[PDB]
């Protein structure tokens, strides 16, 4: 159901069909799975263990991991706890975060390698998306990112309840690695108006388009609404890399995306201001973009 | 609380402590985890998918996989189905089994590589167990083996029910790869008097000592009673390699394990005959070994 895109295949000629499949998934659904991503299974297995080690830390160690670099670190709960790292595209922030974690050295080094590999992956995905719209020369390498590790502490009581309410991601694109054993990711299919489970598929990643994706693409890429249902009584652990917006914080569709049959949809805006707008309105499912129409 | 043994570490000098931990786990519990086993993570990931692909085959493809070599192939169900391969230590049998599976070539190749790698593992484990009892020169390379791929088709109605009843393995040693998501394996811990779960730990294997282990070791290695509770409403998939008995089928303890304080416990017997005896008495938890006292 959710399209699977092989990233090694996507490209030209023989890759042309897979690139068109990529664009179609971004346009119709805003969500797809990625294979061919090049992240080694050994590193994935080390990261799974390391993230569980981190969340299995005594509460007091977890709390020494709060605010270890400005704005980032451990975030306590309501069944939710997380480690967040901004700016995950900045090598000096990634280095200091991992050096500052109260954790065993082998854990800190695995997190560092994985955040670095996820950054390269989301930049590679963003580039292939941009090329499916005919855009070359775009570099996403220095766009700020937010790396997050989360755990949802499900119990028997929370089974059946949406373990995360419906929202869009504010930013451009998101790459997610879901718990293999507990999948709850559901995305609203904009063509039927129905939630579609994104069942876990080991060793692959999920990609979601966010609000900045919709705006930068001049409406061509769908900012996907999604939620997480609690589907078992077991803690769910997941990892996400959020590609946010350009380094200069300005969101503006590129020239070549304004047609004549698809006129320019949104005024130029600053990502940080948009984030404030979601905050003050409570509109966290893309509604606030309507207030930014051109 | 199941001891974990690092196989690269175990051996001499610097591994003398680990070897003694190995023997102690075998003698007191009959069960231990192995790390450092050298099965690469990529192969483990490919096998998890291949085994799930095999069990997801249509019913007609599964029936075409019954009896593909004499005595081996698919076995249908109540909630249990499986693919078994004897003799998994015999290259000719492994080759013909995988050549004859009705499945895509990449599945056949993955199963072949896995069966072969699991064979090398269980031989290496057997050798280290033998060395922990001061035994060298022993070669297990040609002992018959059974390779099994299992699926227990749990549902909401299965939860809280035994998945497999309490028994011992008849053979020497068993190496298991349990479903990372669905546990359920429990062993009767001698020190405790109650069954204790062997919760899955990704990328690690569980080793269990069987009845032939107890007899060959002259009583020094415990043949562990185990079962599997249904702990979740999703299918549980597992892989096991059973090291059975010597090629000449005779079970007889080596001289150096019978001393003034531990005299010879069991008469020599043919493994085949011992299997018959379990089948005809219904004694599947090691009770039938008492009929073989010296
Ligand atoms: O996009 C973000 O994660 C930051 C943010 C700012 N105001 C918000 C409202 C709802 C959801 C997220 C945000
Ligand atoms: O494992 C098998 O398929 C054969 C077997 C060996 N010992 C057994 C005890 C009870 C039932 C079957 C067996
Ligand atoms: O799906 C998850 O568990 C975390 C990522 C998420 O839900 C989000 O995009 O904010
Ligand atoms: O299929 C399994 O998970 C193992 C069942 C069992 O009791 C065994 O290993 O003999």
Author numbering:
A (entry chain A), B (entry chain B): 3 to 79, 84 to 300
Report text from the authors:
Here, we determined an X-ray crystal structure and performed functional analyses of two rice 2ODD family enzymes, OsGA2ox3 and OsDAO, which catabolize plant growth hormones GA4 and IAA, respectively. Both enzymes formed tetramers for OsGA2ox3, and dimers for OsDAO with the aid of their substrates, thereby enhancing their activity, as schematically summarized in Fig. 5c. With increasing substrate concentration, the enzyme gradually forms a multimer with the aid of the substrate itself (effecter), thereby resulting in an increase in enzymatic activity and in the active catabolism of GA or IAA to maintain hormonal homeostasis. The results revealed that a monomer–multimer switching occurs based on a substrate level, and that the resulting conformational change enhances the activities of these enzymes to maintain phytohormone homeostasis, in full agreement with the allosteric theory by Monod and co-workers.
